[PDB]
Structure formats: structure tokens, C-alpha cells
Write a new protein. Structure first.
Ligand SMILES: N[C@@H](C[C@H]1CO1)C(=O)O
Ligand SMILES: N[C@@H](C[C@H]1CO1)C(=O)O
Ligand SMILES: [K+]
Ligand SMILES: [K+]
Ligand SMILES: [K+]
Ligand SMILES: [K+]
Ligand SMILES: [Mg+2]
Ligand SMILES: [Mg+2]
Ligand SMILES: [Mg+2]
Ligand SMILES: [Mg+2]
Ligand SMILES: [Mg+2]
Ligand SMILES: [Mg+2]
Lengths: 368, 368, 368, 368
């Protein structure tokens, strides 16, 4: 039942992603000394100018200058011409910091969860490739293989699909668009060649690459001193690339900068968890689990499982499976998913869903 | 086939929405003197501090101080204690301004369109009510009826649904959560009473209000000097409340601050247009139109119509209907939808879709 | 030998003075926990926006938000309309903080010292009155006597003089100009009356007030929401009001924000010390002591005493008196003057010289 | 009657001086299109971040981005590593601009004027050399002779004096301290050599250089990426280096950023004028003219001439000479000195007094 789809992703150098990372870096820095630290912060950046805003109630001694500059260094901004230098950039900290199982969900909410068997990660091929494409570039950057590669990058992958008496099977990569920051001493011809052979063909399964697959490598020509500027960088502005690449559903809640007590993060993770668990347990090939919460109430206020006719069990057979295998109460989620651990920074880029190294990405057994 | 859903919206005073409005106000200010002005700007705010960033190639004389302060005044920030005063706030302008039909779509893209017959607006009841709830509060604020009401507000509406051999039929409003900024001289008891009788019951159809409907009015107590701080307001961070309240699909593209040449805005509008037209023409009760574009190419690179079995025509009968009634090329879209007109500021709040006063909300005839 | 002179001073609310105080407040906050803390910071403010910049090598835990907001509170900025509210203003901290007798003067320098017997403080009448005028207003503000009085103020005092076979004897106050911020509910007539009877006549000695003395109270009319704005506030920009009101000599070195190791502060204090000691010891009626330092060298590189023919001893009789009573080496200065003590904030306003509560203002014995 | 003195100066790259220049550049930009433009602005900078603040009532179209960036370019900040790049730095403009002979002096004031015959410029040798030292470095920088030389620099000159039955006669340069920013590829040994032979010895008269003269060239080692940060540059914070190097007297009024209607600038210029005229006319070898003004009154409120016994005429013979040759009323000053002309930027560095290219530096005839 043919149709096509496109998804995108950005590198660690993208202005918005730098803020997402810095905000989560501050979250990590607090969890390490106080796993109960209440973090609610965000970052704004603009050409060698980083603004740390936020309200965080914790009891840990943190050097915000150090945590912000270290994060910028990690990303790869050490030289001047790159558009950012952790040693010289302005780090304005306007942060306010205080000191002092059946909890109850804060704020009426509705979290979504999604999973599909088109890839081993249980995530849309389009977004997975988009992320992996950026990931590979960072590797070649940090390894030395492609020393002209700079932190800021953008990726778009559009794959042609076809349904299957249930749902979504990828056929081939229609076109790929990738833009990456770079050093001056490197020709546009050499860049485009390296992007096709060393990054694209090294991550995209042969099955999907074609003789007609369209490539748009460095379309707008040069991207040298670009760096993290883009008029301004902000936290929580890359909501779709942090999730499913526009495939599931999204209520609009941002992750980065918020601790484990905010249902926007935790419950979203939990919802992905059960979704991934369901397909992994063969109970379906594609699911859209919807978990609703009521302010004050701990136990979820109605969970809905949405298979696209890919399950043999039947919605409200699968719901009982979820109700017998999962306890989606906020407090239980953080305990089961180990959400007090400082893993949030690595979650701040290349997507929150898909990577197996995260608790919520480890499928639960599911006793049926 | 019961399930519940929740959606949210924010008032004109919400930090993020102030930026969305200011950014669009600058867009309007340029279109009025140069309908071909290239606008790409964004705003950041934080307690009496507004930062205007951006790159805009236009040929019009604009007083940015005037357009920013006027927008803040319009929102209702004239006094000190409200958390913003257009006469005293810092307006830092770091704006860079230059001077000098079958076009061709910029940037690989994938826009979504959605519509459902559950309301006359052809939008999800949950998001419509959420928006209208905030709209009414602004009316009572500007009329004088509720003079304690202040600009910043947040709304959440969760409605219980049930499918119907096709899709989505609202049954009742399960719970409503509304928080609004206010003046000191007004009791929490009087506020909650006014919110239920004068705002909620004056906008929510009797059919949906129940004896069990849950109300959470000013849940966190007092919201007085809670003016635009919310730890830094930003542009394009309220992506879901600007669209379908998490019902359709969203690629992640922001509207506010971008002119009509960016497919992220125009094409998204066009997609809504055809979606609304389809259901209005009785061709379906619920649609998810998906329009894809290829960088460089003008004509859309594959459009997909997604009915949920609510159409009698059959996808790839409806596609021809769309291909015979619509010309979704970027240039044609702006011409047909009159996208060079300065209506963008009023689009910057209370949702981009739903309100009939916008070109894209006027259903096209559809000759079949 | 008639001539006239004018001097000025500003209140604790003056933008520049707020920065001078905040900068010194941060200095105090460090000295209390590490008397060897190396402080080099400055502040910038602009309508509810305070920027703390600086490089400080210390080993003490300080809450910059607390030290900045507390200083703003102390000044009297607690309400909105006053142009500053310590509870709501933006405190952007871009501060960088590290951790780890015959010293030797840093930076080639030339410090000046001045003293005259026209007042018991051994300071020019013009500047003393100018300071006292502002001081009294703060008292009436903090006591409650004049509750309409606000933090920002400016004072100018011009006195008619006459020489005396030596130097400078004040005759009468020619004119007084005073401007002070205020609340709305207070008439311009009532303000001007209170300024003349309760502030001016309560501080200016009867001997100097005349029937011709000119008064300019609130000349520019109203000064309500003025507050600390004045387009921006800065540290070290009120160099003359911090010293002698334009009577001695000034090399241009700023005090506030610099610790006791900077000769610009310490040596300047030391120079005032000896000047005050000389006149107090009857060795002269007016002196301008000039102390020069050489980078690297500890012992002062030539000290010059400048009496205006008011001494009977004779320059280079008085120099030996100074060389036999004083050891102006940097390290000795800080030890003798107890410069590691946190008294710098109270030094940040109403003048550094004159007030007896400071070590350098306590005359040394002088054995001759 | 031996004594020593020291004075300092800073290059066009010094943070404070960059602000002084930018502020005056904006003043020039307005005068060129509206000689009656009311300018009152100031600048703040900090590592690739320039903030333009101010209130200016004028009727001229100015591109503040252009005037700020052009000024930074002129100074020599075009590359990244230099600590500033006019093409990449953040120029935040928070400027507010409106549109619409016997005047009367604004604000009670007291301006000082000074001149001495120790140099042809009629300025203290110490400050003249200090300025010229920096000037030469800029020449070698802009010529190409010393291509490693960067914009930021600081200079200190201490000369040994001796009185003369009147006053001040320089004997020799005791020590010279000079620090200048530089490129990486240049040894500390080569820099110090070039500073002594090509800059110092090329500007300092042989008569003053000695075999004992102490040189401190690049004392603190390397000053590479020491670009404009110096923990925030500001306008009007270099008050003494803009005048007499601590030789005359200074009330504390800043020049840069203020138009010709502010007595702080105009009258100060006028006072220098008469001082220079007096010594040039042989009426004295050293003068300290003191001009006082009364708010509202046009004609100066008492002018005092202070010779140090270097005149044969006698104070109150010289006063009549001044009263018969000069009309120091504000309006007349601007007319006679051509103060509506855009020469203020070149006045913003290397000193306001001394250079003959300025109107006030051209001695008036003086008919006696
Ligand atoms: N910086 C932009 C592209 C550069 C080349 O203009 C980006 O995010 O891809
Ligand atoms: N704020 C100015 C005066 C006010 C009345 O215009 C001052 O520093 O005196
Ligand atoms: K945007
Ligand atoms: K968002
Ligand atoms: K100034
Ligand atoms: K100064
Ligand atoms: Mg993107
Ligand atoms: Mg492109
Ligand atoms: Mg970019
Ligand atoms: Mg002053
Ligand atoms: Mg006045
Ligand atoms: Mg003021």
C-alpha cells in the first residue's frame, strides 16, 4: 500500500542540541551528588554566548562554568573558527539553586509510545538511519578518519514504504540529504565523496541503497564557520528528532532539562518501553501505546494500545497483558527504569529512543 | 472502541507564545511594506528582557522597538507586577537586515495535514476546547468582566472518546485543568468559581459537561507575579499546541518567525486546507493527508491521503480528487492562500488550525 | 584669594554605585571564608538585569545569586515600580572561579593622597557635604521619616572659598543641587520642602547656609520610576566621587571589585592615611602626598609630599617624618590597615575617604 | 624641586576604549545627517558581544550594526583568535531613538583646564609619551612593519621632574612599561626588541632616554588571545587617560557618548582651549583654568585661573585677559569650536587633549 516518509536528525553541534546537552549535563552533574535533586533548567546559545537559566532544588556543589564548558568541549568546540570555543565563550549563569512508589503524577498528561519491527531497534527506519548517519560522522570526526568534519550537522532520510496486511515495511532509500560543518582546507568534491562512501554506505544496509537513490550532500555548498549560531540555539526545540521522527504521536512535552519527576520524560520513556516490549514479544508488529495520567493520581488514568491490525491477540487482550506485566505509576517507573542515574546527557542527542543502552530500551519479558 | 485523549494550549502571556507573537509581529511589519520581504527571525524573553534575533532580507523601514513593545502591550503587559511592562522592559535587538509559480520547494520536506468531523472546525474537540478556553479568558480580560485575569495561562482538556466503524467520536469531557495568572486582590475561591461558570461552562457544549467531569482550576494555588519568565520563553517551542494537540503527525517544523517561502509553514497550511476540504466535501470523516517535497522540485514528491476507513471513495480515488482540485506547488500555495498578507501574528496564538478567518481554513469546492 | 568649587555624590541607588557595591559585596563574601581570596570582578546592570563578570581565584563557597540579590535588597530595591526588585531581577553570573611583608608592588603605579583641615574629616567641605547629603536621605528612607524617598539620588554642592597664606578656607555654600528618586504619592512641593528642612539644614553647618544660598531640589521635576537604569550601570565609573570630589589628583585607578593586592586600592588608602596623619599632627593644613611604585619592587619608588606652603617643617623634613613613621610597602600596608577584612562594601558608596570607621582614616601618631 | 610622575594610556583595542570609540562612532554617524542630533549613548563589550545602550533624539537613518562593526574593523578586529571579529561578534542594540548662542548651561558644573610648556603640545610629557607610544604601535600595525602587533595595548611612562621658580621641567624617562596584544608566531625576545628600538626609541626624545632608563616590555609574558574581554569593557571608564594623565584636576565627567550640548564635554574642551592659549601667548608656563557653570545660566558662574607662579601678569589680570578674549557660554563654545562636526571618534582614543587637529587645540590669538 505504497507511501513515502521522511525524517531528520541533527549533530551534537546543532545550536538546539547543544542546549539540550548542556541542560542535561547540568542534570547529570546534580544526580551524581544528589539523586533526588530537583532539576528544571534550560539553555540558550548564540555565537560564543551561552545562557544557563533554571530553577533547581538540590544539595550538591556544582561548577556550572565547568559543566557548560566541558559539554562544549565534548561536542568538539575547542577552536575559534568553528563558531564556538569552550575556553573563550561567554557562559552567563542565571541559575537559581535552593538546598532542601505511589507518589502521584504531576500535571494532567498524555504520553505516547511507539514501536515497529522494521528494524532491530524497533524504531522507524527513516529516523534510525537519520540518527546513525549523524553518529557515524561524529565517529569519523573523533577518530581522525575525516579530520575536516565539524560538530554541526543535519540529516534527512526519506524511505519508500509499502504496507502489509498489518503495517509498514521499508523498501528502499529514495533520497538522502546531509549537511555538515567543515574546515576550510577541504574541497566540496572531496566532502561529497566521503559522505557517500564513508558515512552513508557504511551505515545504510545494502538492501536499501539503489542506483536511483538520490543524494544531496552539502546542497547549500559550504558550511565552514557556520557552527552553533543559526541566529540562536534553544532547549526543547527539537522535540520530534528526539522521539520517532514524526511517526508516533507527540503531545509536545520536551525532555532535556527536566528531571525524572516530570511525567513528560519518565512516562514517555515508560510508554516506549512497553511498546518495544510488545513487538519484541511477538504480540504485534507495530504499536502506538497511549498512556494518560490524572494530576494527583498515581495509577495511570487509562492506557490505550493501538496496533494497526498487526496483532493476533486483539486490543483489550493486550491491555491486560500490559496491566499484568507493567506498573506505569510515576514512582515505580523511575525505580524500574533506574531514572535517578546520570545518563541524561547521552540521551540529549541522536535520539532518546532506539539505543539499547537505555533502560527503557531493554524489552521486558512479558508473561502474557 | 473507547479511549481517552488530552490536549493543551497556552495564553498570549505564555513566555513561548510571546516570542511566537513578537516574531510574527516583525513578519507582519515587513509584509505591509514589502510583501516579498524575506523573514527569518526568532525571539527570546526572560523577565522584562526581550531579545530579537534573526536574518531578514527586506526593503522596509521598521521600528523594532515599536513592533516588540506594541506586541507586549497588546498581550496585556502594561503594569510592573504582571512580570512585564512594554514601557520598561529591555528590548535587545540583534537583528541583521539587508536590502535587496513554479519556484521549487526549499529543503527536502514532509508536511502533514489533519481533519476530523467531530467539530465544525474540523479539528479535535480536545484541542479546540483547550484553545477556546484560553480565548474566552482573554475576552473577559479585555472586556472587563474578569479584571483580575492576567495574560499568562495554560489549559488542558481531556475528553473520553469512542470509535465508530470509521473513527473518533467524542463522548464527554473527563477533566479540565486551567491555570491563569492573576492580580493579588482576588480570592482563590472566587477565581475557581469564575473559571467554571464564566469560562468553562460558557464555551464547552452542554452535551460534554458532566456531573463527574473533573475540574482542576488553579491547581498550584496562586499564580500572581508569574509573568513571562518560565525560565526563558522561546520561539518555536510550542509546536504541538500550534497544530493538532497531538492528533495528526508532526515533522518538527516551527511556524512563527518564518515567511511564506519556507515550506514548513506554507505547505503545512496547504495540507490542512486539503484535509479540511476533503471532510467538508463528505469524502471522509477523518483524514491525515501527507505531502512530501523534494529539494529543488516544485511539484510535490508524492502526496498520501490517510483516511481511517471513513471514506467510501477509497485512497487512490481521493488522491485523484486532490490532484484534480489542488496544485500544492509552493508558489501556487502562497498565491492561492494569499500568504503574503500580514495575518501571521494572529496565527501565533490560540492555534494555527481551526479558526475560519485564515485562508487555509476555507474549504475548497472539490469538483470530485 | 577667592574662588569657588563644586563636588558631587550619588546615592546607593545610582546604577554605577549599585555595581560598585555588588562587586565589593562579592569581595566581602570571599574574604570572610578566605582572607587570601584573589578577587577581580565587576558588575553591569540595566533595568532588572545584573551581569556579574570577573576572574576570582578563591577557596570559598559563595552563592552569587544570594550576594547580588541581598545587595540589591539592602539598597532598597524590593518593589517593582522602583526600577529594581531583588526577587525578580535577572542575575546573569558569568564569573570564573578557580581554587588554589616584602612582596613587591604589581604594575608600575602612582598613587595620590590628599587632606585639608577645613573639616574634621580632613576632606574638602564640598565633597563631605555632598556625601552627607546623600547619607541623610538614606537614613530618613530607612527610618521611615521620609517614606517617599527612593534609593537613587544625586547631589552637588558648590562652596565659595578664600585662600589663607597657606590654603583653602570655605566661606559659604553658594548653591546646592539635589535630585532623588521617589514614590508617586508625594507632591513636588512637599519633596522640595523636606529636602531643605529635613536633609540640607540638618547636615549643613549654620555657618555656611545663607539667605542667598541657591537651592535646586528636584530641578528636572519628577524622578519616580527612574531607578537604576540610566541606560546602564557600571563598576569603576564613579572614580572621582569615590575620592576627593576633584580636589586632589587621580591617576584613574578604580577601587571597587579589586582585592587588597592591587596597589590601586591599597596604596591609595595608604596615601590618604599619611595625608590625614600629617595635617592631624599639625605638620600642615593641606597636603597632597604622592607615592610612586615600581613593578616588582616592594619599597615605594619615591614619595613626594606636596604642601601648599601650609607647613612650617618644609618638604624634605616632612618626607623624613613620613619615612620614619610609615612603611608604605604593599604587604605592610594590608597588614597595618587590616585590608583582608570584609569592609569593602560599605566603602563602595558615599566615598572611600572621610569616614573614620575605616583603618586608613585613623591618623597615625607621627613621632616627628 | 625633584619629584617623579607616572601616566598611562591604552590602545584602540582596550575593551573600555572600544566602547568609547563605538559610542562616539554612533555620535559621528548622527551628526553627519543631523548636526542637531541629541546623542546620549554608551557601549558595553565582552568577548564577541557588544551591547549598544542609549537614548538618542535624532532625525537620521543609521545602521547601528554597520557603525558598530565598522568601528571594530577599524580597530583591527577582523580575525577570530584576536578576541573579536566584526563579522561574527554579537551586536545587541538596545538603543532608543526618537525623531523631533545664549542657551544656558545644563546641570550645575565645574570644568577644569590644564596646560604646561614642557612639550610643544602643552601637555604633560608623561601622558604625551604614553599616548604617542600607543599611537606608534598602531602605525606599525597598520603599515605592516610589525605584523604581529594586535589592537589591545597598555602604556605607562614615568618621568623624573624638577621644579623651576614657577613649575614642572622634565629631566628624564625613569621607566617605561608597555604591554601589547600579539600573534602566536613571534618570540617574546623579538617583541621586546622591537618595542625598544622601533616604538620607544622612535618616539621618545634622545634627551630623555638614559643608560639607566628602565624598560618593562611585555612584563607578564604573552598577551595573545587577550582580545577585548578584560572582564567587560565599558564606556567612560578611562576618564584620566582621556585627559591629562592625572596632572590637572577632574570632576569625573565622561566624554564619549555625549553630544556637544553636555557641558561635561564642550566646556572641558573650552577650558583646555584657554589654558593652551594662555601658555602659548607667553602669559604663563603652567595653568589650571577652572570654569564653573550654574544650571540654567548661560554665562559661566565664575572662572578661576591657576598659575603656579609662572605668570608675570598676576591672576586677576589674566582673568580679564580671558574675559576679553573668550566667551565661554555653552552655545558660543560649540559655534567657535565647531562642535557639531563628526570628529568625536578620533577623540575617543589616544587622548582628547594634545593633538592639534582638534579645534580646542588651536590656540586663540589673545589680544591681552
Ligand atoms: N548551518 C546550516 C547550513 C549551512 C550551509 O548554510 C545547517 O544547519 O545545515
Ligand atoms: N535619574 C536622573 C534624574 C531623573 C529625573 O530625570 C538622575 O540620576 O538624577
Ligand atoms: K523558529
Ligand atoms: K517543542
Ligand atoms: K558615558
Ligand atoms: K574611571
Ligand atoms: Mg531540524
Ligand atoms: Mg538546501
Ligand atoms: Mg545551523
Ligand atoms: Mg555623577
Ligand atoms: Mg537639571
Ligand atoms: Mg539615574
Amino acid at each position: 500500500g505504497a507511501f513515502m516518509f521522511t525524517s531528520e536528525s541533527v549533530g551534537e553541534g546543532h545550536p538546539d542540541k547543544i542546549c539540550d546537552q548542556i541542560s542535561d549535563a547540568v542534570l547529570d552533574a546534580h544526580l551524581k551528588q544528589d539523586p533526588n535533586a530537583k532539576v528544571a533548567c534550560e539553555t540558550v546559545c548564540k555565537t560564543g554566548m551561552v545562557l544557563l537559566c533554571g530553577e533547581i532544588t538540590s544539595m550538591a556543589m556544582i561548577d556550572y562554568q565547568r559543566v557548560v564548558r566541558d559539554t562544549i568541549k565534548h561536542i568538539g568546540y575547542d577552536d575559534s573558527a568553528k563558531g564556538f570555543d569552550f575556553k573563550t565563550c561567554n557562559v552567563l549563569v542565571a541559575l537559581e539553586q535552593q538546598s532542601p512508589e505511589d507518589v502521584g503524577a504531576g500535571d494532567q498528561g498524555l504520553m505516547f509510545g511507539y514501536a515497529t519491527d522494521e528494524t532491530e531497534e524497533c524504531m522507524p527506519l527513516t529516523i534510525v538511519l537519520a540518527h546513525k548517519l549523524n553518529t557515524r560522522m561524529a565517529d569519523l570526526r573523533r577518530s581522525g578518519v575525516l579530520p575536516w568534519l565539524r560538530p554541526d550537522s543535519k540529516t534527512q532520510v526519506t524511505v519508500q514504504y509499502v504496507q502489509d496486511n498489518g503495517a509498514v515495511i521499508p523498501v528502499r532509500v529514495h533520497t538522502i540529504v546531509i549537511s555538515v560543518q567543515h574546515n576550510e582546507d577541504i574541497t566540496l568534491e572531496a566532502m561529497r565523496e566521503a559522505l557517500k562512501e564513508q558515512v552513508i554506505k557504511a551505515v545504510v544496509p545494502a538492501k536499501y541503497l539503489d542506483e536511483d537513490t538520490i543524494y544531496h550532500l552539502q546542497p547549500s555548498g559550504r558550511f565552514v564557520i557556520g557552527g552553533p549560531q543559526g541566529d540562536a540555539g534553544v532547549t526543547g526545540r527539537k522535540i520530534i528528532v528526539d522521539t520517532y521522527g514524526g511517526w508516533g504521536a507527540h503531545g509536545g512535552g520536551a525532555f532535556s532539562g527536566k528531571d525524572y519527576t516530570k511525567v513528560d520524560r519518565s512516562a514517555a520513556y515508560a510508554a516506549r518501553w512497553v511498546a518495544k516490549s510488545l513487538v519484541k514479544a511477538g504480540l504485534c508488529r507495530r504499536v502506538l501505546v497511549q498512556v494518560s495520567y490524572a494530576i494527583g493520581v498515581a495509577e495511570p488514568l487509562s492506557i490505550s494500545i493501538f496496533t494497526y491490525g498487526t496483532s493476533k491477540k486483539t486490543e483489550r487482550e493486550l491491555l491486560e497483558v500490559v496491566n499484568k506485566n507493567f506498573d506505569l505509576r510515576p514512582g515505580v517507573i523511575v525505580r524500574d527504569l533506574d531514572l535517578k542515574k546520570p545518563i541524561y546527557q547521552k540521551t540529549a542527542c541522536y535520539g532518546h529512543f532506539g539505543r539499547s543502552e537505555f533502560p527503557w530500551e531493554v524489552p521486558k519479558k512479558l508473561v502474557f
